[PDB]
Amino acid sequence: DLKASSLRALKLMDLTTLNDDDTDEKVIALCHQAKTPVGNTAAIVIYPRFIPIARKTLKEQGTPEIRIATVTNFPHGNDDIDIALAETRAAIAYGADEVDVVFPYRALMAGNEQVGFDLVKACKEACAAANVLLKVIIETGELKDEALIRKASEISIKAGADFIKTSTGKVAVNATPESARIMMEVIRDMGVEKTVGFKPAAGVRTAEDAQKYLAIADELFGADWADARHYRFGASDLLASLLKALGH
């Protein structure tokens, strides 16, 4: 089953490079990696400044259907909506297909439930007006407590998140199977599985990991639920493991 799981995970991957030393050449190489011998990843994830050259690279290699995702309010998740919205508008103008925005998780931990709602909603409004999907990163490894993880997921969903995403990859603790279960249970309990996807990020490293995460989705929503609109692997390291499991 591991081989079948690995191809499924590959076709759901948000193949990521988000490094301080990123260059145009590193992003072009990433676009080439996204076109694998066994099929294409769902998307790439890059800083907003690399969207235009990534678009041309994906087009010229014959994979314009690989989506371009990016990050905003990132990685800090500050509570300044004007800044988060301006970055989101810039990402749209660069050409993003998808924006992964960081939820203001420290403000929620400090007792501000409203700002996360208002921030997600403002960014969702800009994205939806551009036919851009909005993922919300809640930073589970900083929230830590299950109740806060549920609360942040719930606020994000009510404010219009198209995906909820565990982590930035820029803190020590990122996706865990337990954090994934909690957030997917929020999707389940709210009844929003048709409109809200799930994205574990930065914690999924091996083909075995990816199978475990997809098993949670299959168990909660049925094996047909986890398609590209409802599940992605945010990963900068996993692709080589999945290709190894597939004999490539």
Author numbering: 3 to 250
Recite the paper's sentences.
The structure of Ec DERA C47V/G204A/S239D variant was determined from crystals after soaking with DRP. The electron density map showed elongated electron density corresponding to approximately two carbon atoms. In the refinement, it was modelled as an imine group representing a reaction intermediate. The conformation of the loop containing mutation G204A has pushed the position of its Cα atom by 1.0 Å towards active site, thus narrowing it. Because the residues of this loop participate in phosphate binding (of glyceraldehyde-3-phosphate acceptor), the S239D mutation would probably decrease binding of DRP both by introducing a negatively charged amino acid residue (phosphate being also negatively charged) and by narrowing the active site entrance. On the other hand, the C47V mutation, located relatively close to the catalytic K167 residue (about 5 Å), has caused only minimal alteration in the position of this amino acid residue, as it is located in the middle of β-strand.
Deoxyribose-5-phosphate aldolases (DERAs) are acetaldehyde-dependent, Class I aldolases catalysing in nature a reversible aldol reaction between an acetaldehyde donor (C2 compound) and glyceraldehyde-3-phosphate acceptor (C3 compound, C3P) to generate deoxyribose-5-phosphate, DRP (C5 compound). The 3D structures of several DERA enzymes have been solved, and there are also a few complex structures available. These have revealed that despite of relatively low sequence identity, all DERA enzymes have the ubiquitous TIM (α/β)8-barrel fold where the catalytic amino acids as well as other amino acid residues around the active site seem to be relatively well conserved. The DERA reaction proceeds via Schiff base formation between an active site lysine residue (K167 in Ec DERA) and the donor acetaldehyde substrate. The active site of DERA is located in a deep binding cleft, where the donor acetaldehyde binds to the bottom of the cleft and the acceptor glyceraldehyde-3-phosphate to the upper part, near the cleft entrance.
